[PDB]
Amino acid sequence: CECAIYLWLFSLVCEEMRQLFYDPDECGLMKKAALYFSDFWNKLDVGAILLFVAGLTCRLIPATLYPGRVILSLDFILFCLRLMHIFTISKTLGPKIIIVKRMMKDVFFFLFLLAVWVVSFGVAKQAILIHNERRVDWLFRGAVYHSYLTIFGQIPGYIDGFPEWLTVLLLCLYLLFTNILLLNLLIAMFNYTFQ
Amino acid sequence: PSCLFHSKLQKVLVEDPERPACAPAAPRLQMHHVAQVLRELLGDFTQPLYPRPRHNDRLRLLLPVPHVKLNVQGVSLRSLYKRSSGHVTFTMDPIRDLLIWAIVQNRRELAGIIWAQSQDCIAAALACSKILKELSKEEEDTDSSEEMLALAEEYEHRAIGVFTECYRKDEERAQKLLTRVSEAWGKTTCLQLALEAKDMKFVSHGGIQAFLTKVWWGQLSVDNGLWRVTLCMLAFPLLLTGLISFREKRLQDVGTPAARARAFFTAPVVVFHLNILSYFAFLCLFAYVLMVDFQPVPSWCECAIYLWLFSLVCEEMRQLFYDPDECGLMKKAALYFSDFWNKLDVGAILLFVAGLTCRLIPATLYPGRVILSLDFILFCLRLMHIFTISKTLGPKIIIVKRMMKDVFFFLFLLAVWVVSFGVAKQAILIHNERRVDWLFRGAVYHSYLTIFGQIPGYIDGFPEWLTVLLLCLYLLFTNILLLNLLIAMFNYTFQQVQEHTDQIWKFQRHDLIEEYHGRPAAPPPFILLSHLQLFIKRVVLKTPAKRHKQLKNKLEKNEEAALLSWEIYLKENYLQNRQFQQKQRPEQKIEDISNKVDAMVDLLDLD
Amino acid sequence: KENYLQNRQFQQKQRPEQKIEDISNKVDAMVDLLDLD
Amino acid sequence: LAEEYEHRAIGVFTECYRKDEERAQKLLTRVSEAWGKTTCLQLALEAKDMKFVSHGGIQAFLTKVWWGQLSVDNG
């Protein structure tokens, strides 16, 4: 089964070489490649090529089999966004993925907006309560990884809970900016731009 | 001659040509030739409009078939046979027939004049609007099919404004004027015309629906909401006090408790909740036959689940035989099979049978456990098909009619997008929980529970900075894009078709009211009596012509005259003001000066 | 082509704002018209 | 004016789609004679007709290019 993964990609880049030679000019080899390089989506298809190679040499070095484990797993998610680039096909699918063309750089925006705003509380939660869970690269877990899980729900409430009236307080104060302002006025950021 | 109905006139010349059906020579059109294609243009009603049968059968007349000595198709009642029949004239309508003759030669503004002398003046403005829709339906390919239906809309708008005046003066007579008899175009007295004339506008107009809010709420009251009527339906002695007043109790006609009961029984508001809350109690019975009675024996309770469904399919057989044709057994079943919702009611039948044989094979009692549990959820969607009843319920379930295939859409959109992370979560972290069909649990079932919350955070948590990462990266596409822009996918489409979704629901208010007019007052416990009340009647009367629990308003020709002469008076009263409101357009008075100054161009040219 | 552009001109001719100022062109032909005696 | 001449191009397909649409989709595809190739659809790609290709039976003809031979109707 491992040999079957080799040349499926070799079976499809010739179709792009068929797209590189069906009807462009007989002279432009670096010029119709600028028609390719005009789109970041085509560079997002180049990113699907090279992250395979980043894990390939990490697999070809058997001391890096855990880099052989993790890199091609992140190469997996480059194809489904490329598949959402392909599955822009229905009237219910397509033009609403033309809405996300106004949102791909805004995917990076509200990420940087909110996840840095996470740091305004992700540090401020572990400040007063006396926590003691630390290791090498699990000191990061007991202070940062146990902060984002409490947003979407995994709350060690018997662990994080005289500083109890403040533990009520800042948990009420911080969620008033994310769940109310940054969520429900973001709905106004999305309804108006859709209309 | 350029009309496509004229091509259908040449077709209805050869729909029954010379030799096979009208055995003498006939390359000449006649007037039952127009009636037999008016059979196609309207529905399946009483269709006088030409004295169609052998007394004035206008189908066979170019070779000398003799006089009334045949009386099988020969036509000589008025005068002698001279390849004619005589003054056998229009038989209800000179000018309503000229309303046809303008529009079947496609003369729009002539029928605008002819309507002002046409005596129908409401139902023709529905029926010809349907005929203009029929002419739009058959063939024009451009340039008049839209102009038919815009005129059909304008003639519906003509039908709008004539009820607009006549509802304002004697609305109680106007609702009686909604229900006339089988005389002119036969039956479909200007409301059953509107069903196949597609009046999503006109049935949803002022007191049409309020009269339908007197068909539903048939006798008793209209005013009280669902608060204190549902108290009396369980508290049986609460009716005899002064909690609600009947229309009987309005004039204090309550002197008999059975008259207090049976007018309440035959009220269509009560036949609904009797049909609902007994069948709503059946779904609790269908649960209790599986909750406690999940047993391989017919118990005292397991036998009760058998023929409740047999007690209701005869009501659909009553719907299969109340008033369709006496010939179409596979044709009115296509009226059933036209709707996937009816096939969704067939799905409620067959998933019972899928678990029945799985229960009848005792080696498949776990298929006997699971299949009828999935048959349970087919009835509540069928109940949401039934409980499309309120102004707050109904038209917002007409919003989900734009969403039922979009239920399947965002399912396939999101749950395949789940696989983009549901595989990617278990990739790096070293998990070891596997069995036979629980290897599926430790990789897939523990992924969807983490979306809505059941996160084994002490299990899924050096690869910790990435476990922060992709859990932040993936939820930015689902909870932000696929959720909050889906709110934009729902707010705009709600604001888009909200005027249609109310009016089409009002256009489908009546079909349940039609079903609750043609329905006895017996509950589905006792409806097997009214099932067998017609079966003991169909052995002593072998005909489907006993009763019509329907409109069936019989109107005397003398009392109609006080209505119709006043109604014809309301025709030229309204159209004058409609012309006057058309005359109140100032854009004429813009160009009225232009007509006036063009009379002053020549006026200085006489010397 | 000339079938549609005529109707396109006719729908342009169906602009009433011309017929607003068509009177203005007409009455300007009646300014001079009382100036011959 | 380019929009108006696209609007001119709007209205001339608006009439010619209404009469012999089957000839009009053949009239969408002419030969390499006058301005050579790009027979009024491949012109529209670099002419940026986000209006005109999305107009009535242009896309329905494209719903006969896609769904090339067999049917169009079934979902």
Secondary structure of B462-524 in HEC code, one letter for each residue: CCCHHHHHHHHHHHHHHHHHHHHHHHHHHHHHHHHCHHHHHHHHHHCCHHHHHHCCCCCCCCC
With beta carbons less than 8 A apart as the criterion, state whether B553 and B180 touch: yes
CB atoms within 10 A of CB D61: 20
- Give the position of tokens 């039609």: B514
C31 near B CB under 8 A:
no
From residue A47, give the alpha-carbon distance in Å to each of A20, A104, B210, B278: 18, 16, 65, 63
From residue D65, give the alpha-carbon distance in Å to each of B169, B351, D72: 59, 41, 10
Query: Cβ neighbours of residue B60 under 8 Å, at least 6 residues apart?
Result: B22, B23, B24, B26, B73
Residue type, B315: E
Outline where chain D has alpha helix (H). 2-16, 21-27, 43-46, 57-65
Question: Among candidates A115, A150, A113, which has minimal Cα distance to A129?
Answer: A150
Question: Among candidates B348, B300, B349, B342, which has minimal Cα distance to B320?
Answer: B342
Radius of gyration of chain B (CA): 33
Q: What angle do CA B273, B275, B277 make, to 5 degrees?
A: 55
Environment class of A28 (CB within 10 Å of its CB; exposed 0-12, middle 13-18, buried 19+): exposed
With beta carbons less than 8 A apart as the criterion, state whether B89 and B61 touch: no
Contact (CB<8Å) D11/C1 = no
For the packed helices A182-194 and B482-496, what is the interaxial angle rounded to 10 degrees? 50
Outline where B82-235 has alpha helix (H). 95-104, 108-115, 124-138, 145-166, 171-177, 193-196, 207-215, 229-232
With beta carbons less than 8 A apart as the criterion, state whether B520 and B223 touch: no
B211-242: string of b/e by CB count within 10 Å (b at 16+)? bbeebbbbebeeeeeeeebeebeeeeeebeee
Q: Which two tokens stand for residue B159?
A: 């039908």
CB atoms within 10 A of CB B186: 15
Radius of gyration of chain C (CA): 15
**Three-class SS of residue C11?**
helix
Environment class of B41 (CB within 10 Å of its CB; exposed 0-12, middle 13-18, buried 19+): buried
Q: What angle do CA A10, A16, A20 make, to 5 degrees?
A: 130
Experiment type: cryo-EM
**Three-class SS of residue B31?**
coil
Work out the end-to-end distance of chain C between its first and last CA atoms, rounded to an integer number of angstroms.
50
Quote the DSSP letter at residue B563: H
**Three-class SS of residue B338?**
coil
Q: Which two tokens stand for residue A58?
A: 């990490």
Distance CA B62, CA B23 (A): 10
A112 near B CB under 8 A:
no
From residue B263, give the alpha-carbon distance in Å to each of A134, B259, B355, B379, B526: 79, 6, 42, 30, 17
Distance CA A68, CA A62 (A): 8
Distance CA B555, CA B563 (A): 11
With beta carbons less than 8 A apart as the criterion, state whether B425 and B445 touch: no
Interface size B-C, in CB pairs within 8 Å, comes to 23
With beta carbons less than 8 A apart as the criterion, state whether A170 and A122 touch: no
Distance CA B6, CA B16 (A): 15
- Give the position of tokens 């649990």: B441
* Chain Cα centroid distance, residue B198: 9
Environment class of B122 (CB within 10 Å of its CB; exposed 0-12, middle 13-18, buried 19+): buried
Outline where B519-602 has alpha helix (H). 527-535, 557-583, 586-601
Outline where B425-464 has alpha helix (H). 446-452, 457-460
Smallest Cβ distance to C23: which of B587, B594, B604? B594
Quote the DSSP letter at residue B445: I
Quote the DSSP letter at residue B451: H
**Three-class SS of residue B328?**
coil
- Give the position of tokens 């200085």: B604
Query: Cβ neighbours of residue B83 under 8 Å, at least 6 residues apart?
Result: B61, B62, B64
Nearest CA in chain B to A185: B484
Region of D38 (left: φ > 0; alpha: ψ -120 to 50; beta: rest) is left
- Which of B139, B142, B340 to mutate to test binding with chain D, by most D CBs within 10 Å of its CB? B142
Work out the end-to-end distance of chain A between its first and last CA atoms, rounded to an integer number of angstroms.
50
With beta carbons less than 8 A apart as the criterion, state whether B243 and B234 touch: no
Distance CA B510, CA B212 (A): 7
Query: Cβ neighbours of residue A125 under 8 Å, at least 6 residues apart?
Result: A147, A150, A160, A170
Q: Which two tokens stand for residue B249?
A: 């109790």
* Chain Cα centroid distance, residue A99: 18
Environment class of B123 (CB within 10 Å of its CB; exposed 0-12, middle 13-18, buried 19+): buried
Distance CA B253, CA B248 (A): 4
To which H or E segment does residue B438 belong?
A: none
To which H or E segment does residue D1 belong?
A: none
Chains contacting chain A through 3 or more C-beta pairs under 8 A: B
D22 near B CB under 8 A:
no
- Give the position of tokens 């919702």: B341
Quote the DSSP letter at residue B431: -
D48 near B CB under 8 A:
no
Work out the end-to-end distance of chain B between its first and last CA atoms, rounded to an integer number of angstroms.
52
Q: Which two tokens stand for residue B585?
A: 């357009």
Q: Give the alpha-carbon dihedral of A47, A49, A50, A51, to 10 degrees.
A: 80
Distance CA B180, CA B162 (A): 16
* Chain Cα centroid distance, residue B201: 13
With beta carbons less than 8 A apart as the criterion, state whether B273 and B231 touch: no
Q: Which two tokens stand for residue B408?
A: 């399947």
Distance CA B455, CA B451 (A): 8
With beta carbons less than 8 A apart as the criterion, state whether B269 and B224 touch: no
Distance CA B190, CA B213 (A): 17
Question: Among candidates B401, B473, B463, which has minimal Cα distance to B431?
Answer: B463
With beta carbons less than 8 A apart as the criterion, state whether B113 and B98 touch: no
Query: Cβ neighbours of residue B544 under 8 Å, at least 6 residues apart?
Result: B321, B322, B323, B326
Nearest CA in chain B to C24: B594
Question: Among candidates D13, B337, B428, which has minimal Cα distance to C8?
Answer: D13
Distance CA B195, CA B126 (A): 10
Distance CA B373, CA B295 (A): 15
Environment class of B59 (CB within 10 Å of its CB; exposed 0-12, middle 13-18, buried 19+): buried
What DSSP assignment string belongs to chain A?
-GGGGSSTTTTTHHHHHHHHSSSS-SS-SSSSHHHHHT-HHHHHHHHHHHHHHHHHHHHHSGGGTTHHHHHHHHHSHHHHHHHHHH---STTTHHHHTTGGGTHHHHHHHHHHHHHHHHHHHTTSTTTS------TTTTTIIIIIHHHHHHHT---HHHH--TTHHHHHHHHHHHHIIIIIHHHHHHHHHHHHH-
For the packed helices A182-194 and A104-122, what is the interaxial angle rounded to 10 degrees? 170
- Give the position of tokens 């859990």: B471
Distance CA D5, CA D17 (A): 18
**Three-class SS of residue B415?**
helix
Distance CA B414, CA A84 (A): 12
Contact (CB<8Å) C20/B600 = no
- Which of B403, B468, B483 to mutate to test binding with chain A, by most A CBs within 10 Å of its CB? B468
- Give the position of tokens 């007063």: A128
C10 near D CB under 8 A:
no
Question: Among candidates D59, D48, D75, which has minimal Cα distance to D21?
Answer: D59
Interface size A-B, in CB pairs within 8 Å, comes to 82
With beta carbons less than 8 A apart as the criterion, state whether D19 and C4 touch: no
Q: What angle do CA D5, D6, D10 make, to 5 degrees?
A: 115
Q: Which two tokens stand for residue D72?
A: 């169009």
Distance CA A110, CA A193 (A): 15
